[PDB]
Write a protein that binds this DNA or RNA. Structure first.
Ligand SMILES: [Mg+2]
Ligand SMILES: [Mg+2]
Ligand SMILES: [Mg+2]
Ligand SMILES: [Mg+2]
Ligand SMILES: [Mg+2]
Ligand SMILES: [Mg+2]
Ligand SMILES: [Mg+2]
Ligand SMILES: [Mg+2]
Ligand SMILES: [Mg+2]
Ligand SMILES: [Mg+2]
Ligand SMILES: [Mg+2]
Ligand SMILES: [Mg+2]
Ligand SMILES: [Mg+2]
Ligand SMILES: [Mg+2]
Ligand SMILES: [Mg+2]
Ligand SMILES: [Mg+2]
Ligand SMILES: [Mg+2]
Ligand SMILES: [Mg+2]
Ligand SMILES: [Mg+2]
Ligand SMILES: [Mg+2]
Ligand SMILES: [Mg+2]
Ligand SMILES: [Mg+2]
Ligand SMILES: [Mg+2]
Ligand SMILES: [Mg+2]
Ligand SMILES: [Mg+2]
Ligand SMILES: [Mg+2]
Ligand SMILES: [Mg+2]
Ligand SMILES: [Mg+2]
Ligand SMILES: [Mg+2]
Ligand SMILES: [Mg+2]
Ligand SMILES: [Mg+2]
Ligand SMILES: [Mg+2]
Ligand SMILES: [Mg+2]
Ligand SMILES: [Mg+2]
Ligand SMILES: [Mg+2]
Ligand SMILES: [Mg+2]
Ligand SMILES: [Mg+2]
Ligand SMILES: [Mg+2]
Ligand SMILES: [Mg+2]
Ligand SMILES: [Mg+2]
Ligand SMILES: [Mg+2]
Ligand SMILES: [Mg+2]
Ligand SMILES: [Mg+2]
Ligand SMILES: [Mg+2]
Ligand SMILES: [Mg+2]
Ligand SMILES: [Mg+2]
Ligand SMILES: [Mg+2]
Ligand SMILES: [Mg+2]
Ligand SMILES: [Mg+2]
Ligand SMILES: [Mg+2]
Ligand SMILES: [Mg+2]
Ligand SMILES: [Mg+2]
Ligand SMILES: [Mg+2]
Ligand SMILES: [Mg+2]
Ligand SMILES: [Mg+2]
Ligand SMILES: [Mg+2]
Ligand SMILES: [Mg+2]
Ligand SMILES: [Mg+2]
Ligand SMILES: [Mg+2]
Ligand SMILES: [Mg+2]
Ligand SMILES: [Mg+2]
Ligand SMILES: [Mg+2]
Ligand SMILES: [Mg+2]
Ligand SMILES: [Mg+2]
Ligand SMILES: [Mg+2]
Ligand SMILES: [Mg+2]
Ligand SMILES: [Mg+2]
Ligand SMILES: [Mg+2]
Ligand SMILES: [Mg+2]
Ligand SMILES: [Mg+2]
Ligand SMILES: [Mg+2]
Ligand SMILES: [Mg+2]
Ligand SMILES: [Mg+2]
Lengths: 257, 134, 158
RNA sequence: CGCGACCUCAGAUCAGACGUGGCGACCCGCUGAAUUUAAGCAUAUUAGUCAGCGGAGGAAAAGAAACUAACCAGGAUUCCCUCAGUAACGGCGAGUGAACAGGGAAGAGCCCAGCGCCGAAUCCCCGCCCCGCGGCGGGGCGCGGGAAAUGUGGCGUACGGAAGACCCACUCCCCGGCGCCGGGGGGCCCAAGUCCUUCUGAUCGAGGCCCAGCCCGUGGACGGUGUGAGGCCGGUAGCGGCCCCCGGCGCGCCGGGCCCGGGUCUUCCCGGAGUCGGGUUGCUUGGGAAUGCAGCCCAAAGCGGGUGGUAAACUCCAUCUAAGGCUAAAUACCGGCACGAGACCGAUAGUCAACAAGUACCGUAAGGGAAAGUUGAAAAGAACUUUGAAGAGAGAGUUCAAGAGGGCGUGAAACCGUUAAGAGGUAAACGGGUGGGGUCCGCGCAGUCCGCCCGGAGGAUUCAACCCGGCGGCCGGUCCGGCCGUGCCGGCGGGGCGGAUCUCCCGCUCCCGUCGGCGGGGGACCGCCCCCCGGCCGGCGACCGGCCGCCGCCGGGCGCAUUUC
RNA sequence: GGACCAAGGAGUCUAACACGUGCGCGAGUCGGGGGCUACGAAAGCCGCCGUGGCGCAAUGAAGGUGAAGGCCGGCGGCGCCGCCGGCCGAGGUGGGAUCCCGAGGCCUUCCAGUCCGCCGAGGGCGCACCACCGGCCCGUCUCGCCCGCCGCGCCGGGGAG
RNA sequence: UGCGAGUGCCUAGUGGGCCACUUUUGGUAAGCAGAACUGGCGCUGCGGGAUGAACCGAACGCCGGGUUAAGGCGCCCGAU
RNA sequence: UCGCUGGCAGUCGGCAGAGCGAGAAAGAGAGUGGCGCGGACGCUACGCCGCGACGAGUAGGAGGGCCGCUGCGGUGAGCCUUGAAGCCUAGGGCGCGGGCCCGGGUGGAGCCGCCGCAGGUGCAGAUCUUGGUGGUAGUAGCAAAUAUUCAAACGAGAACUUUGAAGGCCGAAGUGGAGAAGGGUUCCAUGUGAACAGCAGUUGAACAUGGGUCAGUCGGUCCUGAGAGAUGGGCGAGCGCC
RNA sequence: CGACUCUUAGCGGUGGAUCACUCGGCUCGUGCGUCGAUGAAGAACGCAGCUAGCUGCGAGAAUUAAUGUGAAUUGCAGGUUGAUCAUCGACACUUCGAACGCACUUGCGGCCCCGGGUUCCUCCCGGGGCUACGCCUGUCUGAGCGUCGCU
């Protein structure tokens, strides 16, 4: 807010006596705004309680190592069909979930043939769902240039641009990501993992160079390796109903007293 | 999506620049589509309205197929008056009803040197655009 | 008022610190402006190095840092005349000069002289008049092969 | 006495110029508090801050060491990170508080006076001729007039310089005009549904448009249009188009300005005073036996002077050269001209001001300073009859709606009118327990179904079994084949990464093609990784294919009625 | 304090510190300043951009110094130090969650004996932590005797309490 | 005889008190002023003392049945 | 609520065999010799289930909110001109409560649930701020300076306007006639009766239309007074001052 | 029964909350970064057919010229060889104001030149151009028992 809002006027308390309430009053004169209450948050006019300042802590810092950890987590969760379904993408007719296409796609330059490619890959139901989900935003976002809202469509990861962005920029919901500049803000909208991504063959080949393997460090990071697992076999039922554990157990007591 | 860093997507700015436009901008804003045969023969899609163009009303209470000649283009209210779109006042005077030019299709233009110049310029620009596209 | 065990602090907030608070909201804009100006300079000097003239090897002064080397201000007059470049010609061909710097020992002198001579052997001199080559010019074969180099002209590595 | 120079000093509506005042967000120079904190208060803090005065620019100021240091030394200024809440200051209380070095942004250096040498080699103005001209300059001509020896110009400035002599090298500089070749400002244009059916007062809504899931899309930002539009319109996208004007980097021509360098030796030349410094006083600083500034007194030197964070003497070192001047960049910007955006406010909010707002209004004045947005899609703003003096009513009419009638969107509460119901001598209201009466609801008014079996009437293409085809789930004690390993073992295997593990060539420096030394390249070795070959192990339940076997399901035949439904 | 009603109305933001929780890496960690590549003023990268901050070492006003020892064998001046060479080599006591061993024993006719599982008197190696005893580093005090050499000195070093 | 113990951090509010049986100082005395021990009120409702901060009983989630405490049983008003 | 830091992965099913509550440690142990195709529910493990004891509270502390408000990122092939937000309701209900969901009416263009994020986020008070409305109450009051009556006219309308008559007052230091300061069109005429003139009005200093101020000889202009104020000069950091 | 009072509900008033809107603010960022004696900022007064305020303009006064554009403006009237808008480089720009002939009533002047008076003979009238302070370079006219030289 203006740092001088509500402090323009000259005003002072009438004091005790006068049968008024010791708040500052506007100095005299034959107007409505006269002896009326000027300073303080409770008055009509005057400042507010704590005038918001511009030097609030607006930006936050996070460690690079866990930036990379989260981006790896998002990529890992993007390749499990149940998680994409839970996120809501229509992928019931996708051939294989880590959907990778030929490098010739990177040379497209027409939105019509981009749409044809989506039709062939059977990912068009998601764009139709985005179309169905376009509507007006509720509240005072209307009059602040955020009038219209819609749903996130599938993302497309490319290695080198040769018109792929020109082709896919016009289709709603589609976002384009260079493989070497991945970001969590677009690979996990709303903080939720499992966005439906369509890869290009070159980008898919280059991904393990970017992030390294379990035994090989990243080739184009300064010093980065994949994060370790706290537990390797996460399937709990298989562990529990195994002969080794079933052997060293007492008999269950499931009779209710 | 708009990419020019010098034009506004700002709602209030657009409404201000529309409701406080000068007359020579009002003229461009008040444009109407040409009919099918006219657009096919002139290779032009839209055209600003003039005082003596014959038109059809497409939307509203008066939508129909009859032809009406514009009688005046009142650009301060962004309206035009067609000579048989009118209603009856309480006393008995007949009064025109204003129709926005965008809900009106032109069936016969009036042509002079400036009109022909504008039509040929628009047609040439469209043709070179198609040639560049193909 | 002091409380249970804690640290006793001295905040320097008793002046009017709020009437002068320097925020950094224009930091990205300043970075973009600086790099645009840098590119404009780099392409206004067409074949010349982007980082500017060559600079000599320097020891850091104090005991804390006297084991490292870095880049200096300019080549001194003594090493410049040992190498054989003229005072007024060094900086017109691309050699930084400062007349304030001494030369106490001989190894640093000789290292700077070697650097200067190697740079002189390396540089390519265009003709003053494009169709009129002269004695000290470079030939057309490397005139067609000349280009800019990025970063420091000869990185100083310890 | 007069006349004539010069020096000082006047007067002009003399000829031609220049300053004043405004704004003031950022900057430069003075002046300069007190609230406040110290739980009192006087030094200290607030604070070199508010207020006051003066002066600019598009930035200003600063700036090329009378520097930092004590190292193996750095090298103009300015800004950022750190140094650092540190050394230091402080009723040593409260509190205050830098700099060097290191890493970056930017990077650029120069000119006088003085000492000297060149016949004042210098500059200004008037008149005339030619050229150019909206930045008043170029050439020529004047026995034209002045400034200047009480010092103009050329060379030249601490990094040394000048002259002479000898060697080597050199004619690629600049500007004033003219013409020619390839960013900014303005103007006008450039895709596709008003398709069929159907809601509505109005559609931009709803459904559809095939086997091309209507058409465009490098254009699905936005705004308008009678609700809610990628295709109705303006725009949006495009290294898209066309038309004018201005500048630059380029080119050629004309003309003018200068006849200019480097190395070696010899001989000469070499600097800024009421200033530095000292005493004292006052302010200031972290600067403490005095950091900086100023007043007054004293008052310099030339191997001198300044500095080297404790006063002084003596003695060696180090490092600069004051008392003259100019200088872009990086840096600041709540005023101004344009712009773009927002996890901001939404008419008691947001600027005081969304509106005829610094307006009305109050004060002698300095100054103080409001309230105030919304009919409807479109005025279609209620013709006409009637009562009344009129306001104001009754009809009539417009509109989808007057239950929107000119302060008119929605229309809450306090308060009031009327209608209906109920009640009423301990003010009223309230908690717990019932009872009575009302208003509505149950769509209450003969009251649950759900499986299995028995019996009776029915009606079907009908059950079990068998055959043909498809799919699926589990296996093969050890079927065959693959793929993987955050596994291993080999290798007469082919590579990338790294190494504070070792050792042929090149470059450099010092030595009469030579010895020894420095930088790099090459080679070997080691570790890791990737790939090819071979062999074990594990998996195929984040990761399977085929044949066989079993089982299940579906479809089709065949089943023909004590079955099945 | 309060006639009544509506709207507004008061622990916020910055910086510092302390502790507790959650995440990543871990004797390291952190680019925040700089640089390179519509939303995007975001995001990504740099490692010879880790300069630097905090941590990894303390103590003294300062000059400064700066964090185990014992045994064997003989000698020089019983022991002790050094020359030596080798060997062991980084505390002890009590209490300690858990782990290890195991006298024996857990039935379907009776005996012998196998495997697996289990319980278990008693005995052990002992985490973190607590208490205590020793030991080592810096300052200081008291008492002492030796060693070193480029300069044998108003020198340097060492011991016990 | 009864009971699971030890131990470490960070921490708000408070720092005007008052009353009663027995002990007790000043004062003629005080619903006065000042102490000791225990329990209360403040922070606490409930049955009785007609009425009451501290008196007697008894301490509290929302309910049904039963029985009691202190105090009561002519009528108000449950119970001779 | 707390404790038991109790129980449940055993839904082990024709590849089957239904158990783990019972005073007193530990095997529903393995082996070596002597037809009919069938079997409820469950377990968002941050869930479900079983026993015990307990429940006062100001200052203060902590936990849980599928309590509530505004905005952002996700998501509901969410809702809506066949009716959103808002508002009213003797209508039906849920929740211990904060609150919420349906029905009816009015209204006419937008809104909400879930997972996270952010905050100018919940009012009964502050002689709180602004706006509005009551009882008081048709009450107090419309009492300083002697005074009015009759007839007519106009007018829809007369205690108050105008005309005439009558009776009074001011009483020449006036309730008269004229100027200065100040006011600024109030002056004059015509018309109107919404608002104002504290009753009313046919009237008005109200409102609306138009009009109206003439100079050699009245004043200013000219003079100087008490005083004010430049230049020369001085002082002054400076605006400037003396 | 009725009046009066109290509660609840319907409708109607008073009042203008809530909800939805928004040509306005606030904050951040970018580019530029420009006043004045050739008369600024500010102020006063005037200008429209019907016009108070706001806006625009200056006696050429809700604008002239020129260029672009290309048929309107509009509340009511009136009458394409270019209406209206925008741009804006030509022209114009009242009185004060640093404010400049002296003072600030708008009063009083002086000088030169035109046109009336005149027939320059002066007055009188109208118009035009000058008439501020400081300061610089040069010019002219000067001053000094200041320093001299010739007489
Ligand atoms: Mg405000
Ligand atoms: Mg809302
Ligand atoms: Mg405290
Ligand atoms: Mg003159
Ligand atoms: Mg001072
Ligand atoms: Mg104090
Ligand atoms: Mg105090
Ligand atoms: Mg005091
Ligand atoms: Mg004091
Ligand atoms: Mg101070
Ligand atoms: Mg100031
Ligand atoms: Mg000035
Ligand atoms: Mg300026
Ligand atoms: Mg400067
Ligand atoms: Mg300077
Ligand atoms: Mg110098
Ligand atoms: Mg420095
Ligand atoms: Mg520190
Ligand atoms: Mg200070
Ligand atoms: Mg530095
Ligand atoms: Mg740099
Ligand atoms: Mg000279
Ligand atoms: Mg729209
Ligand atoms: Mg449709
Ligand atoms: Mg559409
Ligand atoms: Mg649209
Ligand atoms: Mg279009
Ligand atoms: Mg278009
Ligand atoms: Mg464009
Ligand atoms: Mg001080
Ligand atoms: Mg000293
Ligand atoms: Mg000097
Ligand atoms: Mg200097
Ligand atoms: Mg942006
Ligand atoms: Mg309002
Ligand atoms: Mg307001
Ligand atoms: Mg309002
Ligand atoms: Mg409102
Ligand atoms: Mg309001
Ligand atoms: Mg309204
Ligand atoms: Mg309605
Ligand atoms: Mg309405
Ligand atoms: Mg209304
Ligand atoms: Mg009522
Ligand atoms: Mg009644
Ligand atoms: Mg009161
Ligand atoms: Mg901690
Ligand atoms: Mg007492
Ligand atoms: Mg109390
Ligand atoms: Mg208690
Ligand atoms: Mg009690
Ligand atoms: Mg009693
Ligand atoms: Mg009971
Ligand atoms: Mg009794
Ligand atoms: Mg409780
Ligand atoms: Mg509407
Ligand atoms: Mg907010
Ligand atoms: Mg409220
Ligand atoms: Mg309230
Ligand atoms: Mg009365
Ligand atoms: Mg009365
Ligand atoms: Mg009276
Ligand atoms: Mg009189
Ligand atoms: Mg009179
Ligand atoms: Mg009158
Ligand atoms: Mg009246
Ligand atoms: Mg004076
Ligand atoms: Mg009610
Ligand atoms: Mg409203
Ligand atoms: Mg007018
Ligand atoms: Mg014109
Ligand atoms: Mg024109
Ligand atoms: Mg006067």
């Amino acid at each position: 807010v203006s740092e001088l809002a509500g402090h323009q006027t000259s005003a002072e308390s009438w004091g005790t006596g006068r049968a008024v309430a010791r708040i500052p009053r506007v100095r005299g004169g034959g107007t409505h705004r006269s002896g009326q209450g000027a300073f303080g948050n409770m008055c009509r006019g005057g400042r507010m309680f704590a005038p918001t300042k511009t030097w609030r802590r607006w930006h936050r810092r996070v460690n690079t190592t866990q930036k990379r950890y989260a981006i790896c987590s998002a990529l890992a969760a993007s390749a499990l069909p149940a998680l994409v379904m839970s996120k809501g993408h229509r992928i019931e007719e996708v051939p294989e979930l880590p959907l990778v296409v030929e490098d010739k796609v990177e040379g497209y330059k027409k939105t019509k043939e981009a749409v044809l490619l989506l039709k062939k890959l059977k990912a068009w139901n998601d764009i139709k769902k985005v179309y169905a989900s376009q509507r007006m935003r509720a509240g005072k976002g209307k009059m602040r240039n955020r009038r219209r809202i819609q749903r996130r469509g599938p993302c497309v990861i490319y290695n080198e641009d040769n018109g792929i962005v020109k082709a896919f920029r016009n289709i709603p919901g589609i976002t384009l990501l260079n493989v070497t500049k991945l970001n969590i803000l677009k690979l996990a909208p709303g903080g939720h993992v499992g966005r439906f991504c369509i890869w290009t063959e070159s980008a898919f080949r280059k991904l393990d160079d970017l992030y390294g393997t379990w035994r090989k460090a990243a080739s184009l990071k300064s010093n980065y390796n994949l994060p370790m697992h706290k537990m390797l076999n996460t399937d709990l039922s298989r562990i529990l109903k195994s002969p080794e554990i079933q052997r060293a157990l007492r008999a269950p007591r499931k009779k209710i007293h | 999506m708009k990419f020019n860093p010098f034009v506004t997507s700002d709602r209030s700015k657009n409404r201000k620049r529309h409701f406080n436009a000068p007359s020579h901008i009002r003229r461009k804003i008040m444009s109407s589509p040409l009919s099918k045969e006219l657009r096919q023969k002139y290779n032009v899609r839209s055209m600003p309205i003039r005082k003596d163009d014959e038109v059809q009303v497409v939307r509203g209470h008066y939508k129909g197929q009859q032809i009406g000649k514009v009688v005046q283009v009142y650009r301060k209210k962004y309206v035009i008056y067609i000579e048989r779109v009118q209603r009856e006042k309480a006393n008995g005077t007949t009064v025109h009803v204003g129709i926005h030019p965008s809900k009106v299709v032109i069936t016969r233009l009036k042509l002079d040197k400036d009109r022909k110049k504008i039509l040929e310029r628009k047609a040439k620009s469209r043709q070179v655009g198609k040639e560049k596209g193909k | 008022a002091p409380s249970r065990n804690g640290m006793i602090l001295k905040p320097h907030f008793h002046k009017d610190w709020q009437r002068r608070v320097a925020t950094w909201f224009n930091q990205p804009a300043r970075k973009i402006r600086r790099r645009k100006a840098r590119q404009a300079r780099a392409r206004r000097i067409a074949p010349r190095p982007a980082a500017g003239p060559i600079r000599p090897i320097v020891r850091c002064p104090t005991v804390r840092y006297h084991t490292k080397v870095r880049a200096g201000r300019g080549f001194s007059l003594e090493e410049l005349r040992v190498a054989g470049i003229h005072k007024k010609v060094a900086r017109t061909i691309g050699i930084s000069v400062d007349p304030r710097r001494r030369n106490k020992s001989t190894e640093s002198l000789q290292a700077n002289v070697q650097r200067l001579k190697e740079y002189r052997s390396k540089l390519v001199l265009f003709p003053r008049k494009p169709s009129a080559p002269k004695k000290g010019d470079s030939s057309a074969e490397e005139l067609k092969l000349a280009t800019q180099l990025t970063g420091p002209v000869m990185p100083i590595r310890n």
